[PDB]
Structure formats: C-alpha cells, structure tokens
Design a protein around this ligand. Structure first.
Ligand SMILES: O=C(c1cccc(Cl)c1)[C@H]1CNC[C@@H]1c1ccc2c(=O)[nH]cnc2c1
Lengths: 337, 20
C-alpha cells in the first residue's frame, strides 16, 4: 500500500496545510515530569495529559530566544508542517498552543529513546539492522517529498525508537515546503550535502545525500566525514572522497557511492526513476517494502519497556522551571502559531 | 584505527544543528 496511501495523503495534507489547527490545548492540562532532550531555545518534556492519563513529549520553545536567533520562519514552518502530515514513521503532533512566553508542541512519546543513544552504546549496527531502519527513512522521504517537503536534519539524534522497535522521525525545525530550490545554510555539519556547503541553491536531493550519511554511520559506527571542527568536516565533504570499512558489503558500498554522490545528475533519489533507484538497489533485495510500511517486519531491537512514564532509554538532563511572564512576548511574530 | 580516531574526537556526543 505504498501507492494507494500516497494518493489520498496529498489531498489530506493540502487541506491541513492551507487551514492549520491552532490552539488545541492549554499548559494546565498537562503534568510535566521530566526533560527528554534540549535545544537551542527550549526543551522537550515528558508530560501526562491529566484528563486522559496519556503520556506525551512536550516541546517548549522560548519565543524570545527564537526571535533572537532569527528562527521565526523556521519555527512557523515546523508547526505548520507537523500539524498537516500523517505517516507511520513520523511522530504525531497531538496538540499545540502558546502563552505569554512560550510555544508548545505536544507530540507522541517514543519510549525507546533516540537511535543515537543505542548506536553509540553498541558501536555499530549490523547491515540487516541498519537496513531495517533505512527502509523506514526511504519510505518517509518518499512521503515527505511527495508533498514538496524537504526535511533537512536527518541524524540518529532525531530518530526515535517506538515500543515496537520502529522509527519515529522527530524534530521538524528545518523542514520546509518548497517547489524548486532553496538556499538556507542549515542542518548538521556531518550530514550536509556539498551543494549546501557551497551555497549554490539546493533541493530535496540533500535529504538523499543525508540518507547516505545515516546509513554509513549506522553500519560503521562513525560518519563518513568527521573532524574536531565543522570547517574541517566541510573541507572533507567538498573534497568528497569516501572510504569504507573493510566489513562493508560490496552492495552497501555501491549504494553509498550512489547516495554520497556530488553530481546531482547521478545521485540516487534524484534521477528520473526517483526513489525506486534506491528501493530496487541490490542492498534492499531482502526488503519487503509493503511489509515495512505495514509494520509487519520483526524489529531487530525492541527497547526495554516499563509502565508508561518510564524514561530509562533517555539521558538525564538538568531540570528547569517553565516561567510564563505576565506580559505577552512576540505576539505579532507568532500570530499564526 | 578509524574507530579509535572517532572515539577520541570531540564529536561523538549529540551534534548541534546549524542555521542562518
Ligand atoms: O529534545 C529535542 C528537542 C528538539 C528540538 C528543539 C528542542 Cl528545544 C528540543 C529532540 C532532539 N532530538 C530528539 C529530542 C526528542 C526527544 C523525545 C521526543 C519524543 O519522545 N517524541 C517526539 N519528539 C522527541 C524529541
């Protein structure tokens, strides 16, 4: 059903895109519990919806800090896109609202924690393990790209593991709906396509370059381009000569040579055959793409569970009180949120 | 080894985005 869904999906997304849901909950409806992660101008907390008992992950963003770091349009992008999309491997936005000081996005909670945690701990994933995850990302990008959405921040830190061991892509902070090309220098250094670094203008093909980095990092335990400083990483990316671990299969290597491809006219995902150049690659020969979509494949790794509200798969973070000023801040800037 | 070089680097923890 990786065809029938896409058709109905565009019509549904466009309606929500053009008429976004707004102000669908209030802060006092949630018991805040624990910080699950942190960002440039906020944090994500585990919360319990008191009325239903459900647990959620609440993203809290300081309006003033968003403005100061000129992320207003990016933040409006994030919420407008998240409220409009629907796909098995995307976190759900359940509620959103704002108060005098903050913006709130209440999302689905992924008890399995971040892929990043597991990947660093174990060192690296086997190729079948990496393939299982990578298949979900390919399907997700097929979906997003069908909607003229670019994602622009793929990395293990932004991929949650759910109770069944399947991926939930989170963190739509740099997502953008764009027909044609765009120019913002954004993303994470290790994952940036050369087009981005060279400020040439770029398109959805940067996400497929990022898929190449992700698969490399999953199977190797380290990314293809690393250094101590971003500029040194950028220098390696633009030079662009990837070298593979000796344990990489010939098939994996061929796939990565076609994803980590500087030439847009040759990069898989960006040819006339689109995503099927990837789906049909020999490395994915064993993958049942429909089974993956239907979540009927046995996950390689099911996280250690516990009664909802358990956060064993998360790092501990310094807790801070959520202050709400008696005066409204940046109201005009975030009018449509 | 490349792995040992990665582990000795300053970028084995969570990586910050850039913007823009
Ligand atoms: O904490 C986070 C974050 C992401 C963007 C901005 C700010 Cl302020 C914080 C993200 C970043 N990487 C993952 C983290 C996170 C943690 C848990 C969940 C979750 O359970 N559901 C949905 N999104 C999450 C994001």
């Amino acid at each position: 059903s990786v065809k029938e869904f896409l058709a109905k999906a565009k019509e549904d997304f466009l309606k929500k895109w053009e008429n976004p849901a707004q102000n669908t909950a209030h802060l006092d409806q949630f018991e805040r519990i624990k910080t699950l992660g942190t960002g440039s101008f906020g944090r994500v907390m585990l919360v319990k919806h008191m009325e239903t008992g459900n647990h959620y992950a609440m993203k809290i963003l300081d309006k003033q800090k968003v403005v100061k770091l000129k992320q207003i349009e990016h933040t409006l992008n994030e919420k407008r896109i998240l409220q409009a999309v629907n796909f098995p491997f995307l976190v759900k936005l359940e509620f959103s609202f704002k108060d005098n000081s903050n913006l709130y996005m209440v999302m689905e909670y992924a008890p399995g924690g971040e892929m990043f945690s597991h990947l660093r701990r174990i060192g690296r994933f086997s190729e079948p393990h990496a393939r299982f995850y990578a298949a979900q990302i390919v399907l997700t990008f097929e979906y997003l790209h069908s909607l003229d959405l670019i994602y622009r921040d793929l990395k293990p830190e932004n991929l949650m593991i759910d109770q069944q061991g399947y991926i939930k892509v989170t963190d739509f902070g740099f997502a953008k709906r764009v027909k044609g090309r765009t120019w913002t220098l954004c993303g994470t250094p290790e994952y940036l396509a050369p087009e981005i670094i060279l400020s040439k203008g770029y398109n959805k093909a940067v996400d497929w370059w990022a898929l190449g980095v992700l698969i490399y990092e999953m199977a190797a335990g380290y990314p293809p381009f690393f250094a101590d400083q971003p500029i040194q990483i950028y220098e390696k990316i633009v030079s662009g000569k990837v070298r593979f671990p000796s344990h990489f299969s010939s098939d994996l290597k061929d796939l990565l040579r076609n994803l980590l491809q500087v030439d847009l006219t040759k990069r898989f995902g960006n040819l006339k055959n689109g995503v099927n150049d990837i789906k049909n690659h020999k490395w994915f020969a064993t993958t049942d793409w429909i089974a993956i979509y239907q979540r009927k494949v046995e996950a390689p790794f099911i996280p250690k569970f516990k009664g909802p509200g358990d956060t064993s798969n998360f790092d501990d973070y310094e807790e801070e009180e959520i202050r709400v000023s008696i005066n409204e801040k940046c109201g005009k800037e975030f009018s449509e949120f | 080894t490349t792995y040992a070089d990665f582990i000795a680097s300053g970028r084995t923890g969570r990586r910050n985005a850039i913007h823009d």
